[PDB]
Nucleic acid binder design. Structure first.
Ligand SMILES: [Mg+2]
Ligand SMILES: [Mg+2]
Ligand SMILES: [Mg+2]
Ligand SMILES: [Mg+2]
Ligand SMILES: [Mg+2]
Ligand SMILES: [Mg+2]
Ligand SMILES: [Mg+2]
Ligand SMILES: [Mg+2]
Ligand SMILES: [Mg+2]
Ligand SMILES: [Mg+2]
Ligand SMILES: [Mg+2]
Ligand SMILES: [Mg+2]
Ligand SMILES: [Mg+2]
Lengths: 115, 65, 151
RNA sequence: GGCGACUCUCUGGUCUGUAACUGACGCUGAGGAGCGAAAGCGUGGGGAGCGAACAGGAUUAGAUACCCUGGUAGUCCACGCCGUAAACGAUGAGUGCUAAGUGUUAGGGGGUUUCCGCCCCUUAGUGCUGCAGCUAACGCAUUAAGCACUCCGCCUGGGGAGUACGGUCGCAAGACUGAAACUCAAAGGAAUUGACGGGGGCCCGCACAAGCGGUGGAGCAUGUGGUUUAAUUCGAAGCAACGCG
């Protein structure tokens, strides 16, 4: 029953993560995009981000979690709503991380969709 | 804007001169543009080289926060 | 219309209960411009309410509206190649409209022979938090809350 | 053509300034020789990511496509080959001459100034605007599509055809060179006015939405089609013919 923990913001066009883990990155409860029986486009809404974040928060409160250190890693779709949901309990976002390649074209990305 | 290197009369930028190079990087570690710093084109080249040599030997960071 | 909002025409309150809210109902119930028939049914239906309960008919009727009148409704919205029934806050004006419409519609679908009884009985059902017009208000809310995602 | 982490090794050119030296030693350049994106080819490596082909899932009338999930060659390296691209500035090289204005890259000189800095001038790039002139027009305009001279390459209506035959080159793919018969009276360039767009912007109308009542089902009236008839008189045909003349 651990006091402190982490969550991990990493946002794209329509993908975001924020799982509830311990200080050393051992998991406890998890939040990332959906998880909650939502499907399709509803899954990527800001609303559905809240309900995923609440459900992982209320999972971790039962493990005696009081505070959540969260990261920063660019803007995206439903990142702000996911934080608002977590501020039911209350917490901080101190760290700032990144998912970027130090080469433009480190690995070659997949081809542009013709739509 | 005014160039730090032209104004102060610096004609050579050491890679090892860390404290100077910390003025021309972000909190995260990224090299700052000429628009922000207002440095000259020639010095921005000399500076960049100095940054990149510094990063090789862990004087400055690649990425940090 | 394209030009803008339009002057909403007003109805007079009524020669017994003095109620705009209930003159509207005569007009919802009226068919072929026969206002007399709808007045007669209303007034007969309200007598029947007063006898069964004992309370003032107006009162039961306004209690009934509260249970029928919706707050959220979904709205059909084509986005791409699939529909998303989007929830919207019902305007105060429209609440009454949907209130009375559902009351009058589901009144007519009841199995009681006369309309005055059908109306009365349906008004009492809404006050009991059950019936058809209530079940309609329940079902509109269920859809609205099911699509709460959208805004 | 291309070249983008860092370091060292080897190595080519350019620019500025100075004019000590040389004293037309220059320009261009068919053929020749070399270099030459990507894809491709050979041998041997390597193979994360990406991904022709191929498979599966969708989509669809079909879908040997677009979208999704996989995925082989290939993409990478060495050596060799291939020699092509809208290899484009769709603009051959050299030289001179012909208003301005304003950025920017690397220099030089000179102002009052201790520099920094400002200002003036100037060389060589790299952009934008714009005179004269040029242009079918669009536009070009000291980085000319202006005014000139030198040399090279190339064009001669559209198809047939960059095909055939021959030849050279190539492991192959193919490259280069390159016709004719026959056929047409047009192909084209730029600009104009429209119309149109599953282009953009702004508007309107019972156009939709919001409602209320219908039609489409039944019987009947009526008009029309069709069929029938000796004849079923003629006319009306999406909207804008069909209780219409
Ligand atoms: Mg020749
Ligand atoms: Mg290649
Ligand atoms: Mg190979
Ligand atoms: Mg694919
Ligand atoms: Mg060619
Ligand atoms: Mg090119
Ligand atoms: Mg050409
Ligand atoms: Mg030459
Ligand atoms: Mg309508
Ligand atoms: Mg009919
Ligand atoms: Mg006829
Ligand atoms: Mg005719
Ligand atoms: Mg007509």
């Amino acid at each position: 029953n651990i006091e402190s923990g982490i969550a991990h913001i990493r946002s794209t066009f329509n993908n975001t993560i924020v799982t509830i883990t311990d200080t050393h990155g051992n998991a406890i409860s998890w939040s990332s995009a959906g998880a909650l029986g939502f499907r399709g486009s509803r899954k990527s809404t800001p609303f559905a981000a809240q309900m995923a974040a609440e459900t992982a928060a209320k999972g971790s409160i039962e493990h005696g979690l009081k505070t959540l250190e969260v990261t920063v890693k660019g803007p995206g779709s439903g990142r702000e709503a996911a934080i608002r949901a977590l501020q039911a309990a209350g917490l901080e976002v101190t760290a700032i991380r990144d998912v970027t390649p130090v080469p433009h074209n480190g690995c070659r990305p997949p081809k542009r969709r013709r739509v | 804007k005014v160039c730090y290197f032209t104004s102060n009369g610096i004609t050579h930028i050491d890679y090892k001169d860390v404290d100077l190079l910390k003025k021309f990087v972000s909190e995260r570690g990224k090299i700052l543009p000429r628009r922000v710093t207002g440095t000259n084109a020639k010095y921005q080249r000399k500076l960049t080289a100095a940054i990149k040599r510094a990063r090789q030997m862990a004087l400055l960071p690649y990425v940090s926060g | 219309p394209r030009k803008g909002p339009v002057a909403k025409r007003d109805v007079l309150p009524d020669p017994i209960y003095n109620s705009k809210l209930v003159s509207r109902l005569i007009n919802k119930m009226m068919i072929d411009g026969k206002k007399g028939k709808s007045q007669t049914i209303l007034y007969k239906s309200f007598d029947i309410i007063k006898e069964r309960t004992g309370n003032d008919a107006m009162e039961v009727f306004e209690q009934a509206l509260k249970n029928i009148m919706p707050v959220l409704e979904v709205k059909a919205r084509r986005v791409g190649g699939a529909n998303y029934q989007v929830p919207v806050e019902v305007r105060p004006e429209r609440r009454t409209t949907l209130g009375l419409r559902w009351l009058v519609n589901y009144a007519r679908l009841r199995g009681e022979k006369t309309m005055e009884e059908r109306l009365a009985n349906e008004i009492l059902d809404a006050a009991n938090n059950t019936g058809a017009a209530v079940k309609k208000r329940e079902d509109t809310h269920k859809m609205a809350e099911a699509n709460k995602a959208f805004a």
